[model samples]
Target: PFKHPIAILGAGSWGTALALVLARKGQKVRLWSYESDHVDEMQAEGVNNRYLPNYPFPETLKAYCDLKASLEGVTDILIVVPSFAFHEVITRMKPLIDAKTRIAWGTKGLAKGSRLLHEVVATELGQVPMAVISGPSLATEVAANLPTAVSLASNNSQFSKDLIERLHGQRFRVYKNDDMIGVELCGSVKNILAIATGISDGLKLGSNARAALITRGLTEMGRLVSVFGGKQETLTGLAGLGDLVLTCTDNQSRNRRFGLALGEGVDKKEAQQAIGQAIEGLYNTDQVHALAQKHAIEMPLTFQVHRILHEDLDPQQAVQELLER
Candidate 1:
């Protein structure tokens, strides 16, 4: 029964791509950007020149920098900011949120200090219906309209199904589940695994090595999810195993590419700059390793990635240690 415009509160690659999806579905979409210049450019050019230049944005989509204007009378909100910035954005939007709006998050990392993005939303929004959409979706592929599927998780299955009906298309499909914790954990933990796979590639390990790393990394992910009160079977779904495979193996994955550069002897700072994107795994590795230790779980690959990224361990030595164990 929701018919008002859906507000997309971020203008990053994922935000723009999702805006495109909703716009193509004939929904009134308003995309909010913190950068006024980017908003001006997108509004004038009908494309997000900096992030998603190759694809044409749908005409129905409008870009704005004013948060109030964007949220005015909107029925739903999709937040797609980086994980680290999730809290900041939510805090800024808190005063403007209407109780009837359903808030959904597309961010896929744990907040640096506390809960994940969904938890942050729940804590701040106070009982508003919220959900998370995550999977192995790359912004470039999604914007290009390649076939992509995502998992939408919410405690309320009706809300999940309604979101699916509003956003799903022939090229874009959404599978609904009620396992928000599993989806969020899988989305964040997989980045750590991707960094491990990247290190394997950086050390000139062949496809065989990469495949084994992926398999083992996925097992670790499932284990951790189970320890956190999530079902192991949830990790086997699109949000878990599907995303793990994509991030660990795909060249377009920022976390994997950042790891590859580090493995190739590039400095961490330089590798991140060269990748020209936010590599969540590089930053999240340390936090995830700490979480694993806290939970008394064994995550050798995550531990190794954290070591290389922070402890100054050589990539080859890390690989050797893994192989010897």
Candidate 2:
């Protein structure tokens, strides 16, 4: 294991959970937050009662309000921010982090609608080696030390192997994959599929319907991954099938929960209100749909979701469109 203080950027549920993981393994961490109030609260309470309520921080975990200060003297940098904010955080950290630091992220999906986060990092920071931690890991399960396996992917073999050592542990397994593009594309598109399953469940379509939707979603995943230059076989791996099944079936998934609301005929305003957070599926459907059409990739599931979310198609009607075709 890399025996150095880890600087985690972001105080959200995932970031806090990872900090707890390190502390559990008898290591200390520096958890940084963009939110001033959040950093203060974490320091004062020694717990993160905001996104990860009731999860206690180890005495070894220090919360930081200052961005550069968090990176100072750290050997590893783990960014737990959402994809949309990754660019901004990385831009801010460019001047602070040491050159030898091992950089990894615990985020999934596109940085923006059109860009993968790894690509964004390469573009914004220029040729820095990076890795992604992704799979079906729910924040609460992770905090409770439940069994959670995720894929760590990078074109750089050493980068992935080093992270596997740093983050991997019993009940929190990390699998290594060289198919970074495949791993990332699977991570992005599956959120869109989870909503479709959520809608089925919301409509009271029963287990058979949910199963069918999930199966078809995998097909779409394979198709899209192939067209996008990622290995189609990546869909069956931990980051692909593993993540898709978990998010689609579980109530803990925001995208699935949002879809469930839509299936139950809740309006867009109330749907977001139900989840109380940003549903990445809602943003990703448009982007995934655009890619599918551009490559002449037959992604009916993605198209149907885009229609349901943006084209005013009724969720039930959207399901019907999928079945009729």
Candidate 3:
């Protein structure tokens, strides 16, 4: 552990669960939430009534409403906020933080476009040390202490290893890697596959169809990452194939659930409303589709998802488009 405490910037489920992991490892943690009442609840009640309703807050973990106060001198800032809120939070951190502040973002999905998060962060903070964490793990399962594996990747090997060292524990295993491109790309692209698989599952498309989707999804993902100068081998690892299977098969996945709702005749908006949270696939679909088009990468499943989401194409028709191609 660093001489200074680490702060988890964002008190959403992922943020909270990560906080718990660090705290359980006997590391000092400060969890920041934007809402004052939520912070108060987390501090006073020993639980987050809103986000992780069932996961009790450990007394060892600190909760903060003040962003500056939480970040003042922490050794590491693990940003776990929803990707849409990433820019705003970084903007807010500008005045209070410095270039030395180590940032390890929970790699989720691409927001706004196909731009990598490290690219965005560097543009905002002017060359800050940063890293990312991701894989097949879910918040609830992680909080419950089930065995989970995830990748902690960065270009800075020493920094990434230090983060991996601090985050690793009995239940939550963190792997160290320097392939930032592959790790982050796999992290974002898997959600699109999850949506595709969810649609396959919802349509009762049978096991063969589901298998084809997963296989072809992997192929598309592998090709896209290779085009981006990322290694093909990385796409078949935990951050890629592992997450692809987990998100695609699990009912707990918000992206999968959103696609399932659409396949079951629920309108797009209704499906989103039902998920009741930021379904990253809904946000990433069009952007990823646009990226594939820009690169001339053939991602039929991703294209179909974009059509269903933005082109007003029927879910049934979306399937045929892929089949006929």
**Maximum-TM-score candidate:** 1
lDDT of 3 by residue, 92-157 (tens): 987788767778899476655567778878877777778989888888999999999988778677
C-alpha lDDT of all candidate models, in order: 0.84, 0.83, 0.82
- Return the lDDT, model 2, position 233: 61
Rank by TM-score, highest first: 1, 3, 2
RMSD, every candidate, angstroms? 1.5, 1.8, 1.8
Error of 2 at 229 (Å): 2.2
- Extract clashing residue pairs from model 1: none
Of the two candidates 2 and 3, the one with more favorable lDDT, higher being better, is: 2
Return the TM-score for each candidate structure: 0.95, 0.94, 0.94
Q: Stretches of candidate 1 above 4 Å error?
A: none
Alpha-carbon error at 274 in model 3, in Å?
1.7
Candidate 2, 159-181: lDDT as tens digits:
77877876799899998877888
lDDT of 3: 0.82
Error of 3 at 152 (Å): 1.3
- lDDT measured at residue 186 in model 1 versus the true structure, 0 to 100: 85
lDDT by residue (tens digit), candidate 1, 1-325: 5467899988888999999988987788999988788899998998899888977777778998899999998868899877777888889888998778788988877774536677788788777788999887998999888999999988666778888988788999998878888888888789988888888899899899999988888888888788777778778899999999998889888888988888889999998887775677865676677777776999888888888877889899998888666
